[PDB]
């Protein structure tokens, strides 16, 4: 129907741009971060589930101030059989973060982005998110 | 300004049913993956599955360097396209080229992060030993993210697989290899 490469190119573009917006917002405009998530989105944060945009808003306000350094991004178009009639992209991130009052740490994060067509540009939002520190048991 | 991080926890499965399903999948998958011929995974991957590998931006990881995909660093669309493995044939052929492994399955920390009637997304955190070749007996740490659809049998069929491989830290090695005498 459409060439696979089209989906791969779309996935890379959406992910690279989204990741830049996401961690810039996290570090420098935390109150806007929840606008990057779908209303029903969840986050599993070091084994802790947070459900819904309003609960995500609260959780992000409670987290200390952050400085993230992102070193690795990979992404893939998600097969239509898993997300019928819905354009989605898996994004995987590795980096480090310094939270205020805490030692610097390495982390891995993955999330699924979904495309929301609009009168102007298609907007990508997080439908589901997962975050874990490399050294979470310390 | 706050400074408390919430308490970190182990595996998140959500429900007992899902814990059973995913833990059985991982048992079965890694019995083949660690067997010495991975072609048995052809029946675990969708015809149209995708796979890719990433490692830390930087070695003892040279066998993973040629196929590592970091779109932050690598900008060219054609090369980006070529490093993504697509179709079960190309996925499993790639996996069978990687070093032979022994994973500590029962120590995996698993997070199920998305679920619908058509989709399960879970990420697996753990370690594996390389069993042969240039880095025999080395301990790697990894994070692997799977998206699976219901399998026509009763199991899972993988449509997306992202593997991240790194060296285990000195702390991870110490914990993984410890076996002290019991003390009161």
HEC sequence for A79-105: CCCCCCCCCEEEEEEEEEEEECCCCCE
Residues of chain A with C-beta less than 8 angstroms from the C-beta of B164: 72, 74, 92, 94, 108
Chain B's closest residue to A48, CA to CA, is B9
Report which secondary-structure segment, H or E, holds A6: helix A4-28
Of B69, B111, B118, the CB nearest to A47: B111
Strands in B29-138 per DSSP E: 45-54, 85-86, 101-103, 109-115, 120-130
* First-to-final CA distance of chain A: 49
CB A122 within 8 A of CB A116: yes
C-alpha A9/C-alpha A89 separation (Å) is: 11
C-alpha B94/C-alpha B85 separation (Å) is: 8
Taking alpha carbons only, the member of B47, B49, B41 closest to residue B25 is B41
Of B113, B141, B171, the CB nearest to A130: B113
The three-class DSSP label of residue B8 is coil
Look up tokens 């996925």; give the residue.
B91
- How far is CA A33 from its chain centroid? 10
Write the CA distances from B86 to A57, A77, B47, B122, integer angstroms: 37, 11, 9, 20
* First-to-final CA distance of chain B: 42
CB A115 within 8 A of CB A122: yes
DSSP A32-98: GGGGGEEEEEEEEETTEEEESHHHHHHHHHHSPPEEEEEEEEEEEEPPTTTSTT--EEEEEEEEEEE
C-alpha A12/C-alpha B82 separation (Å) is: 13
C-alpha B70/C-alpha B57 separation (Å) is: 8
Of B5, B125, B164, the CB nearest to A94: B164
Going by the DSSP 8-state scheme, the letter that residue A135 receives in this structure is T
C-alpha B130/C-alpha B171 separation (Å) is: 19
Residues 6 or more apart in contact with residue B170 via CB below 8 angstroms? none
Cα angle B149, A51, B5; round to 5? 115
- Does B149 reach chain A within 8 Å, measured CB to CB? yes
Residues of chain B with C-beta less than 8 angstroms from the C-beta of A99: 3, 5
Of B4, B57, B84, the CB nearest to A8: B84
C-alpha A14/C-alpha A36 separation (Å) is: 13
* B:32-61 residues touching chain A, CB 8 A cutoff: 46, 48-50, 52, 54-57
Look up tokens 């196929």; give the residue.
B67
Residues 6 or more apart in contact with residue A5 via CB below 8 angstroms? B81
Taking alpha carbons only, the member of B25, B84, B11, B135 closest to residue A74 is B84
C-alpha B25/C-alpha A81 separation (Å) is: 19
Cα atoms found within 13 Å of the Cα of residue A115, Cβ hemisphere only: 19
Method: X-ray
The three-class DSSP label of residue B45 is strand
C-alpha A128/C-alpha B113 separation (Å) is: 7
1.20.120.610, 3.40.640.10, 3.10.450.50, 1.10.3720.10: CATH of B16-170? 3.10.450.50
Residues of chain A with C-beta less than 8 angstroms from the C-beta of B9: 46-48
CB A110 within 8 A of CB B123: yes
Taking alpha carbons only, the member of A134, A138, A135, A130 closest to residue A47 is A130
Of A64, A70, A132, the CB nearest to B125: A132
The three-class DSSP label of residue B142 is strand
- Whether A82 sits inside 8 A of B11 (CB atoms) is no
* A:87-106 residues touching chain B, CB 8 A cutoff: 90, 92, 94, 99-102
Domain residue spans of chain A: 4-133
- Does B178 reach chain A within 8 Å, measured CB to CB? no
- Whether B80 sits inside 8 A of A8 (CB atoms) is yes
Neighbour-count burial of B132, counting CB atoms closer than 10 A to its CB (0-12 exposed, 13-18 middle, 19+ buried): exposed
Cα atoms found within 13 Å of the Cα of residue A96, Cβ hemisphere only: 7
- Classify the C-alpha dihedral A51-A52-A58-A64 as positive or negative: positive
C-alpha A40/C-alpha A58 separation (Å) is: 15
CB B124 within 8 A of CB A116: no
- The CATH architecture to which A4-133 belongs is Roll (3.10)
Residues of chain B with C-beta less than 8 angstroms from the C-beta of A134: 141, 169
Rounded-to-5 percentages of helix, strand, coil across chain B = 30, 30, 40
Give the count of beta carbons closer than 10 Å to the beta carbon of residue B8: 15
């Amino acid at each position: 129907s459409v060439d696979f490469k089209t989906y791969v190119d779309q996935a890379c573009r959406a992910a690279e741009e989204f990741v830049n917006v996401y961690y810039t917002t996290m570090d420098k405009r935390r109150r806007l971060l929840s606008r990057l998530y779908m209303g029903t989105a969840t986050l599993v944060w070091n084994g802790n589930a947070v459900s819904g945009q309003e609960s995500l808003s609260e959780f992000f306000e409670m987290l200390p101030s952050s400085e993230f350094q992102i070193s690795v991004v990979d992404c893939q178009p998600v097969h239509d059989e898993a997300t019928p009639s819905q354009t989605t992209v898996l994004v995987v991130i590795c980096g480090s973060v310094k939270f205020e009052g805490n030692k610097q740490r390495d982390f891995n994060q993955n999330f699924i982005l979904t495309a929301q067509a609009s009168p102007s540009n298609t907007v990508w939002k997080i439908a589901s998110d997962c975050f874990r520190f490399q050294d979470w048991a310390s | 300004a706050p400074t408390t991080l919430p308490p970190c926890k182990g595996s998140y499965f959500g429900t007992e049913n899902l814990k059973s399903l995913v833990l059985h999948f991982l048992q079965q998958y890694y019995a083949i993956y660690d067997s010495g011929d991975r072609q048995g995974l052809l029946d675990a991957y969708h015809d149209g599955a995708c796979c890719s590998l990433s490692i830390p931006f930087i070695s003892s990881l040279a066998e993973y360097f040629k196929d590592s995909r970091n779109v932050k660093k690598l900008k060219d669309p054609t090369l980006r396209f070529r490093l993504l493995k697509h179709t079960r044939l190309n996925v499993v052929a790639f996996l069978n080229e990687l070093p032979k492994t022994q994973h500590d399955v029962n120590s995996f920390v698993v997070d199920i992060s998305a679920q619908t009637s058509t989709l399960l997304c879970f990420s697996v955190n753990g370690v594996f030993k390389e069993v042969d070749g240039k880095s025999r007996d080395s301990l790697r740490a990894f994070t692997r993210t799977f998206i699976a659809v219901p399998a026509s049998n009763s199991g899972l069929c993988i449509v997306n697989d992202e593997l991240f491989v790194r060296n285990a830290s000195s702390e991870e090695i110490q914990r993984a290899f410890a076996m002290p005498a019991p003390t009161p």
